[PDB]
């Protein structure tokens, strides 16, 4: 059996765990979940309890703490451990009864739950990306230290990758380690995208789409932060960072290669220019459950792929100039240093700007440029715990940075 | 240090071997050309010698054998051992510095020479399809009794089959081993075609099509005998059956897709509905290459996959009216027994006959039907040398039944 924690289970990726899970079940009983944790979503995460009956509730939130004691009592023979803040998370995290965590929490704060993880050695199924991207070299410590903990991606691409490799390789190794992609031989990968919904825009169109028409479509069907990012493609430049150092692979050997039907996920390509690819209907439930199962796999009852019925597959290669925030993503990931941590906080900004209308498509690339410009490289610290430090205190800066570039501008 | 023998070494397939060899070893020095075997092709062999060097020759045709030695005391610094026959054929197996042995002997003809490699428990890179056809339950009992022998498909749909397995599970098992499938998580495969020069065709233009027609049309540069079955589709409809051999696979699992650009070579879908596919340009390099470093790759200087220029991928099911052999091949396969025999020896007839402009195209179907009609399904010897007799026996009885049919008519 699999006893599994479900962080930010009432949010896009928690609720499609949930949803894999509880059909799996139904086939086999392969999964226990053991914990939810929300921020404030108490209704929606008490019905996710009815239903599931965790040990261990958590909301991070102490103001609607009290009403999620109250709402739960309404369930019968069940008394589950009602906890709170970070001090519930910790809690949560240092169970032995728990051994794999998913991390569906959004924006740099699901950092916080994917470090405690790991220092209590659990399998860390991870679909935040911010975390990687800011605390990428952190994160790379921390499972130094920790050796029995792991992180596997949940990203589709990422899953993508990590499905199209040998096992037997990966097990010498592991994510977000030196040299992972030396001892699978990867040469190179093909990070595919979407494209998002201003895809075929004009230049003169691009200047005046606003946040509405980003979040307008049925086909994105996500969180409303990765939406926008998905719009500008920042999202792909985050996830060409956390390509970096979830494998080891140079920048240099990354492609992002725009597939708007969605069916190839990520392409790898080995030192033999032999290409390998994972293939599925736009879903994040295969990502997910993978993650939960991994090194193995488990029958589902989902869709099976008809290639004759998808019939037609594209590629191309985006344009610079209609979205430069990818650009800007290889420019701070080869930069290095803390400049992925810049990158992260001055879009978090101004991704938040964009969507409250507060500012137009091309200011977003213009905000993250002028802060990355302004940012001073620092030296790494050695210990764990300051180069932690370190990232928060960067982190922060980043925003404050943007949030003065964003007032100096209107 | 690989040392390889190359049997079949002067056709299409033991060619590319050669090439890839070459090119590999300019990179790092891996690989030694132990022996070459060919049946008549002297100066070409002669020529390979000179820049390979081998340590064994082998003429099938005896009577080339003194034109092959007079061509060979050209060559500087060389004293090869030059056998002859079937006994030569037989001495190269069994050398003890002979390790990886390349089949890439067309016909039935290949089988001899895969069963004496498996028998000396080599790692047998196998391009020969039709002896898997023929003698799928025999190479299987054999596998069984030289537990060292490895059978390492190079047929570029199953090269690519097996490159999307894990090998972490892929190592744990071996081809045409009971449950190989269940043990890599199979739930099916999709078998890409070419779809061959005829695929546009309608019905009463594909009555008429000719051998001149398959053989100038045709998609890769081969053999006459795998061109003009490419052209009918019995190619795949053999390939079907390799698959279900190989990779113990259900027939009804089993699905051909066109795919008429061939950059996916194949599809594997696990048990989870996810699908894993090995893409490359149209080429035969890379399935030999990885047969002789699997498990393990090695870098090439192929030119890498640029799928922004191939730009589009497209599939569809193909037509059983206008390709019959595909619906026979299904049916001798899920009859079982000694019908996959009888299937692959009367083939080689119509698919002679029709090269050579004898018969009409849906007369090559309408032949092997009739002889997979007439036979009668034979109780199944339980030794290796009987088993091998009885393949034998059937094998020609269809050759004979097909030439008959024939006769009676033209
Ligand atoms: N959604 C997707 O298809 C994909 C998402 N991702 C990544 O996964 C992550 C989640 O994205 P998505 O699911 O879209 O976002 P959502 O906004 O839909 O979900 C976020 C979840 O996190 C919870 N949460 C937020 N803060 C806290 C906290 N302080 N403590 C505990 N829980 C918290 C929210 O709780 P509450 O409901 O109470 O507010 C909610 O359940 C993102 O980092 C994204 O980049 C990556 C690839 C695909
Ligand atoms: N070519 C391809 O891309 C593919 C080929 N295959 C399979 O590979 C096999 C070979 O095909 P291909 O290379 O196209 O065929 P070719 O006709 O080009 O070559 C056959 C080779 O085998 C040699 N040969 C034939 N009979 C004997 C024998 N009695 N003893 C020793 N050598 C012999 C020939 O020697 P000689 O030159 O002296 O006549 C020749 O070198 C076939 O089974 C085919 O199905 C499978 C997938 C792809
Ligand atoms: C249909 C679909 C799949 C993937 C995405 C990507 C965004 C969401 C994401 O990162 N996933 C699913 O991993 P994008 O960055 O390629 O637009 C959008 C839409
Ligand atoms: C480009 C190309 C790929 C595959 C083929 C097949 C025939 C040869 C073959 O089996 N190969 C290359 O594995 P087909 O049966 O799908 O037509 C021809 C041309
Ligand atoms: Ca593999
Ligand atoms: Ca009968
Ligand atoms: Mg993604
Ligand atoms: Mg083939």
New interface residues.
């Given amino acids: 059996p699999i006893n599994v924690a479900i962080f930010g289970s009432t949010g896009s990726i928690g609720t499609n765990a949930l949803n894999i899970i509880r059909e799996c079940n139904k086939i086999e009983n392969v999964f226990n979940v053991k914990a939810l944790y929300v921020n404030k979503s108490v209704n929606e995460l008490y019905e996710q309890a009815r239903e599931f009956l965790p040990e261990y509730l958590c909301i991070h939130d102490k103001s609607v703490y009290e009403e999620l004691k109250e709402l739960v009592k309404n369930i019968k023979d069940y008394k589950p451990i009602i906890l709170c803040g970070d001090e519930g998370m910790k809690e949560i995290c240092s169970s032995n009864s728990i051994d794999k965590i998913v991390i569906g929490i959004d924006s740099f704060q699901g950092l916080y739950s994917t470090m405690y993880a790991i220092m209590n050695n659990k399998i860390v199924a991870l679909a935040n990306k911010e975390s990687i991207v800011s605390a990428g070299f952190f994160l790379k410590k921390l499972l130094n230290i920790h050796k029995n903990a792991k992180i596997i991606p949940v990203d589709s691409e990422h899953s993508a990758i990590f499905?199209?490799?040998?096992?037997?390789?990966?097990?010498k190794t592991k994510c977000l380690q030196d040299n992972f992609s030396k001892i699978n031989?990867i040469?190179?990968i093909?990070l595919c995208s979407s494209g998002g919904p201003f895809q075929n825009l004009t230049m003169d169109e691009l200047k005046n789409v606003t946040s509405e028409n980003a979040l307008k479509h049925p086909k994105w069907k996500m969180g409303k932060k990765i939406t926008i990012d998905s719009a500008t493609m920042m999202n792909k430049g985050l996830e060409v960072i956390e390509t970096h150092f979830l494998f080891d692979v140079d920048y240099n050997d990354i492609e992002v290669?725009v597939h708007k039907e969605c069916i190839?996920h990520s392409?790898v390509?080995?030192?033999?220019?032999?290409?390998?690819?994972?293939?599925?209907y736009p879903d994040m439930q295969?990502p997910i459950?993978?993650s939960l199962?991994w090194?193995?796999?488990?029958?589902?009852n989902?869709?099976?792929?008809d290639?004759?019925q998808?019939?037609?597959?594209?590629?191309?290669?985006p344009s610079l100039e209609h979205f430069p925030c990818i650009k800007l993503a290889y420019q701070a990931g080869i930069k290095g240093n803390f400049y992925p941590t810049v990158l992260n906080a001055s879009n978090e900004i101004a991704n938040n700007l964009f969507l409250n209308n507060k500012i137009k498509y091309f200011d977003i690339s213009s905000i993250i440029s002028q802060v990355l410009e302004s940012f001073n490289s620092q030296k790494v610290s050695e210990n764990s715990e300051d180069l932690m430090k370190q990232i928060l205190q960067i982190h922060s800066w980043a925003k404050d940075k943007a949030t003065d570039i964003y007032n100096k501008h209107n």
């Fill in positions: 499905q199209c490799l040998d096992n037997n390789k990966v097990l031989n040469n190179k093909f290669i190839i392409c390509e080995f030192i033999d220019k032999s290409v390998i690819s994972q293939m599925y295969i459950l993978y199962t090194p193995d796999r488990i029958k589902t989902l869709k099976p792929l290639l004759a998808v019939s037609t597959l594209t590629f191309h290669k």
